[PDB]
Design a protein around this ligand. Structure first.
Ligand SMILES: O=C1NC(=O)C(c2cccc(Cl)c2)=C1Nc1ccc(O)c(Cl)c1
Length: 127
């Protein structure tokens, strides 16, 4: 079982914005999660070949990862904050769908998600 193409991070005809909320999602949210000791499994698309997870992309039909999110934020791919928040939530949910409760990777996702929730709680009002 092979890897799919990664999610796109560039699409010139998709309209985009740089908003204060999106800036916060990069400068505070992504940066906080990216530097965490448990970030590493989430910094790039899951390589199902190297990890010997041939069923991964049979089960996970909407892959997402922080490498992709980082590129989307840096390349101003998004129209609004909700699109980016959805990407983080997709990433966490994929982990919980694929893995078993208590697995290391689930504990890692939970630690990142707790921080994510704390930061999104203080998402600034749109300017
Ligand atoms: O990119 C990766 N390199 C690794 O060794 C892993 C990985 C695989 C199994 C357990 C743990 Cl804690 C990490 C990655 N990421 C990953 C990210 C989410 C997942 O659900 C799974 Cl199974 C793996």
């Amino acid at each position: 079982s092979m890897n799919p193409p990664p999610p796109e991070t560039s699409n010139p005809n998709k309209p985009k914005r740089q908003t204060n909320q999106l800036q916060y999602l990069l400068r505070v949210v992504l940066k906080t999660l990216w530097k965490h000791q448990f970030a590493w499994p989430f910094q790039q698309p899951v390589d199902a070949v190297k990890l010997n997870l041939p069923d991964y992309y049979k089960i996970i039909k909407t892959p997402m990862d922080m490498g992709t999110i980082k590129k989307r934020l840096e390349n101003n791919y998004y129209w609004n904050a909700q699109e980016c928040i959805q990407d983080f939530n997709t990433m966490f949910t994929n982990c919980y769908i694929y893995n078993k409760p208590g697995d290391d990777i689930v504990l890692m996702a939970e630690a990142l998600e707790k921080l994510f929730l704390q930061k999104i709680n203080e998402l600034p009002t749109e300017e």
